[PDB]
Design a protein around this ligand. Structure first.
Ligand SMILES: [Mg+2]
Ligand SMILES: [Mg+2]
Ligand SMILES: [Mn+2]
Ligand SMILES: [Mn+2]
Lengths: 148, 148
């Protein structure tokens, strides 16, 4: 579909404002709740609606050069931050709440309440994602994935 | 100088062959490193080839090459190739003169601990248009800065 958005890149605070105001306009996304749906993709901004199952897990990833923001509309999920050593940080983000991050961010979203709903926005568009992996030696790799 | 190469991105083995072939043809790289020391040997749409001379304190830091495969031939001296492990017990491998190695595009590594005056040839394909540089924030949390 398409939202009526600025023809420029948005910074982290602008992306946070965006996902929050979209949450307040169910006309923009309620039909896509019936598991992801693109609300908007152009040269500047990508916006997705995500519907979660309890087992869903993004795995560890960066968004390459994209800033982003997340708003939980319904339910709750865990924002996870990786630490050297392996005692990663976990923060429960509950319905009504949002956060944003710059393009250096590495994270993992998991542990959602069954039926959770969230809105995610990226600028510049999320054309590439870095997905981290560990082999049986424990050695870490980053696979750059195209999501264009 | 132009390189007779397939007109396409090269894989890690082909890059290894290339840096070893260049190492055996000093006529092609001695002049460009004589005076102040490092030098681009060929860059085009497909490959980036560098000659590097090392100081003992040189350290690339932890980094990926985004989507580029790479290879390294130590011409003289010695380097340490380091690979990250979850937990922080990073692996280290001394790469001595005459030895070469390659890696695919998902590689995260750090080159450091060079014998002063070491000399090496590096090749990337596709060209190294972006690097991911990893760092740790106050809280121990890891970030990846994409560098153009
Ligand atoms: Mg709650
Ligand atoms: Mg050429
Ligand atoms: Mn993400
Ligand atoms: Mn490297």
């Amino acid at each position: 579909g398409e939202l009526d958005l600025p023809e420029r890149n948005l910074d982290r605070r602008e992306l946070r404002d965006l996902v929050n105001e979209l949450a307040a306009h169910p006309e923009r996304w309620a039909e896509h709740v019936m598991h992801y749906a693109s609300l908007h993709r152009d040269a500047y901004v990508d916006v997705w609606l995500l519907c979660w199952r309890a087992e869903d897990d993004t795995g560890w990833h960066d968004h390459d050069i994209s800033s982003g923001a997340v708003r939980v509309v319904a339910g709750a999920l865990k924002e996870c931050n990786p630490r050297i050593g392996g005692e990663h940080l976990e923060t429960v983000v509950s319905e009504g709440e949002s956060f944003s991050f710059g393009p250096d961010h590495i994270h993992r979203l998991t542990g959602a309440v069954h039926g959770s709903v969230s809105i995610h926005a990226y600028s510049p568009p999320l054309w590439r994602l870095g997905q981290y992996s560990i082999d049986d030696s424990g050695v870490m790799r980053r696979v750059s994935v195209s999501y264009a």
